[PDB]
Every structure is written in C-alpha cells, then in structure tokens.
Amino acid sequence: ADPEELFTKLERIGKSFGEVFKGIDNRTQQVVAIKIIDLEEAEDEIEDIQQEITVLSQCDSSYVTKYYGSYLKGSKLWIIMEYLGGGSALDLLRAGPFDEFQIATMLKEILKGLDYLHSEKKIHRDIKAANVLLSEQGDVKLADFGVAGTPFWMAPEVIQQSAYDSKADIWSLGITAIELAKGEPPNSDMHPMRVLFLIPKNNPPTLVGDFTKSFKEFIDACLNKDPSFRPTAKELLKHKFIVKNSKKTSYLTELIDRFKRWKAEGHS
C-alpha cells in the first residue's frame, strides 16, 4: 500500500496547502492528479482537509473533479484525483479574452455543476475562474471547494457571517461571469480587507461596456444583493443569454489550443 510504488509523478502542476503533480497509476496507466500534503507543517488546516475529502467522495458527477482515494506514508498524505489537461478557465484567460459565445458555453457547464451540487444539498463556496478546470477535450468541471483570504467573489451574505445557502454560489457565478468578460473580478485593485466591507455596502457590480443586453441582464440577476431574488442554477440554464449564445464543446477546445500555442510560443 505504498504510494511511491503505486504512482509516478510526471510533472508539477502547481501549489492548496501542498504541491500537486500530474501523475500516473502504475497499475492501470491512468493519468491522475496527485496532491501531497505534509501533515507536520499544516496543523490548523487539517480539519478542513478531511472535510473537503468527505464532500468530494460524496460527489459522483461528470461536472465535479473525481476523487479516487487517499494514501498515507510517513507524514505525507497523498490525495489522488482525476486529471484535467486543459487548464483552468483562469489559465485560458492568460492567452487572451473570451467572446460571449465562449463565455456562455462555459457558464452553461459551470451551471450544470452547480445544479448537481445544489440538488444534492451541497454548496461549492468558492466559484471563480481559477477553480473551473477543463479536460483537454473541453469538458468543464469544478474543483477546489470552499471551507465551511480573498473576498472578491464572496456574496455579501457570506461576508456578514449571516448563515447562507446555495444562492451564494449564484452570486459568485455572477462575479465569475464578469471575470471571464474583463479578466478579473470587480474591485481587483482594492486591498481585500477593504473589499470585505465594500461588497455589502455598495450596490451590486454591473458589466459595463460593449456587451449584449442579455449578457448584462444575466449578470444583474446573479448579483442581486437579496439572495432570494437570485435565480437558481436550473433557471439560469434557460436564461436568454445561455440559450442564445451557448455552443458546442469545440468552442472551448479552441481556447485550450490557443493557450497551448501561447505557452509553446514562450509567453508567460
């Protein structure tokens, strides 16, 4: 039961608490994502780690990053998850802007993710472009669930400590939609401790500029300050913006290919 025999690390992917690799299961040759947390250098995060594992282990959805299991060796905890070779939506943004077709196609898939979670009575809690991973063939999945830092995507009712529900995810989706349109969320320059009070105090963000009215109205519905006035995920799946602008999956692989051309051409 030795994960250094079971698995081979192929290349580093990034750095939550720990470091993550693209890996391979030597028994099946399945490409996996492997996270390694040193449990001797993260005492106060430990309660959150088993919380996140519990939740992902209860998900069995094609729109949620799969969890395959966990291994311990010494003080190292190995967490094995499905591997998504397209990168995050935030990664795809580094090589240029998305158009409304691509944005709508992607929000449609995130919305299916959220509709799954909310119908199983779970809340993602940290919807943002960096937490939306794509397979290389363009599937769109959710990762990096929130704990029950950076407040830019937080709904005002979660900031005020007011016990919240799944409508918090709809607000965050609204902010994610602005992030996919402008590259970054509202108030990106403010210090986060200032943003923690500007979000409940201010009127909701709107999308300003040369965008269709339907797109603008999609975001205005998500960003109602009163949560009971935000639409559910299933309602948003029939919103005019999604219905009129969402396209086949190859609209996303074109973004994946663009990002790959970008990296291979030496840009960073």
Ligand SMILES: CNc1ncc2cc(-c3ccc(-c4cccc(C)n4)cc3Cl)c(=O)n(C[C@H]3OC[C@H](N)CO3)c2n1
């Ligand atoms: C680019 N392909 C790609 N494919 C797949 C995964 C998968 C995970 C993953 C997620 C969550 C966890 C996990 C599970 C339970 C508890 C705890 C504390 N962490 C374990 C992994 Cl192994 C990942 O970290 N990344 C990278 C990440 O970087 C940060 C970003 N916000 C999201 O993606 C992945 N990347």
Ligand SMILES: [Cl-]
């Ligand atoms: Cl891209």
